[PDB]
């Protein structure tokens, strides 16, 4: 084993939602935004060295939708057994008072690929400079997902990642303190 | 409301570049793998009962098998060349810092790529009692790791060896 490239695609009914991404050694190279018909490189610089026609991924997902609709009939409309996520709030580097940092909410080991992730500072939700990955593949064929919050560490602020999933009896809220 | 999920995974496994390559296609319904095409076998094989007539139909078609058998060259080997410079050949310098965490000395190694790294504690280096949190993937093409030391306790030095840095990086520590 030297290098592994995985092309991971999915389609989900009745949500009618599909995704397509490339994974290199556990990292995302790119994904295709189905709504924008756009190739989105994980690092902007990747689009300077390589290209991908987003149209091909959309035609792939149409085939996934047709095949899913056939397989749903063949199983006699049997549904996914929901697996709830285990979620973790951490930093990418050692935390320093008043030194710019990024809080990362890691939502792991869940299915179907549908979540409602919210960041809150002192209770109030925050959407400033926030970013997120797509539904990333796992080897146990469950999903993982990263949510990011750029922040200026303080001794007074309190942070939380609230995640809503259908496998959870109660919405998960993971607390973070300096 | 009921949900139905399809998953398609097309894996290109490279063993020493484009010398030995395998293509593995696996299809999933509601998380369960039902059928798969392994290039080492050259035909579709069922995993569960639903994949039995699925593999039966595709394998009976010469055109389908020739397309799937050529994936190693047309997609796998082609994509290795396209992404080689920014993935296989990607090198980002580690950021090394030492701090204490009772006595337990921490060596924080951050923002490095690729994952392959040598982290040694040193006068003579200590091999026993150097617990690690393991290699942590940040999900953004960087890695981070913390390599501890069950010490009592002298200057302690963390030595880091990585394919990005030409000379071994070192960080010394002393308490006051």
């Amino acid at each position: 084993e030297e290098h592994v490239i995985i092309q991971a695609e999915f389609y989900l009914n009745p949500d009618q939602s599909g995704e397509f991404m490339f994974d290199f050694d556990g990292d995302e190279i790119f994904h295709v935004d189905m709504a924008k018909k756009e190739t989105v490189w994980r690092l902007e610089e990747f689009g300077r060295f390589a290209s991908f026609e987003a149209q091909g991924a959309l035609a792939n997902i149409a085939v996934d939708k047709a095949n899913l609709e056939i397989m749903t009939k063949r199983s006699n409309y049997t549904p996914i057994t929901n697996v709830p996520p285990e979620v973790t709030v951490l930093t990418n580097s050692p935390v320093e008072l008043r030194e710019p940092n990024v809080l990362i909410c890691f939502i792991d080991k869940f299915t179907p690929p549908v979540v409602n992730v919210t960041w809150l500072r002192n209770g109030k939700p925050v959407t400033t400079g926030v970013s997120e990955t797509v539904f990333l593949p796992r080897e146990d064929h469950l999903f993982r997902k990263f949510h990011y919050l750029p922040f200026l560490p303080s001794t007074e602020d309190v942070y939380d990642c609230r995640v809503e999933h259908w496998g959870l009896d109660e919405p998960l809220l993971k607390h973070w303190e300096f | 409301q009921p949900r139905f999920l399809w998953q398609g995974k097309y894996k290109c496994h490279f063993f020493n570049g484009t010398e030995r390559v395998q293509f593995l296609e696996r299809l999933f319904y509601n998380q369960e793998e039902f059928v798969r095409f392994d290039s080492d076998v050259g035909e579709y094989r069922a995993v569960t009962e639903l994949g039995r007539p699925v593999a039966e139909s595709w394998n009976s078609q010469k055109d389908i098998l020739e397309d799937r058998r050529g994936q190693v060259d047309t997609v796998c080997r082609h994509n290795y060349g396209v992404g080689e410079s920014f993935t296989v050949q990607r090198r980002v310098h580690p950021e090394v810092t030492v701090y204490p965490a009772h006595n337990l000395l921490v060596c924080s190694v951050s923002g490095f790529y690729p994952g392959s790294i040598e982290v040694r504690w040193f006068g003579q280096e200590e091999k026993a009692g150097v617990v690690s949190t393991g290699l942590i993937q940040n999900g953004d093409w960087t890695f981070q790791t913390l390599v501890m030391l069950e010490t009592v306790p002298e200057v302690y030095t963390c030595q880091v060896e990585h394919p990005s840095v030409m000379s071994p990086l070192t960080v010394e520590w002393r308490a006051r």
Partner: peptide, 14 residues
Amino acid sequence: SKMRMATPLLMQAG
């Protein structure tokens, strides 16, 4: 330069 992909196979002919 162009990244390629594996195409999914159709299970039925409609």
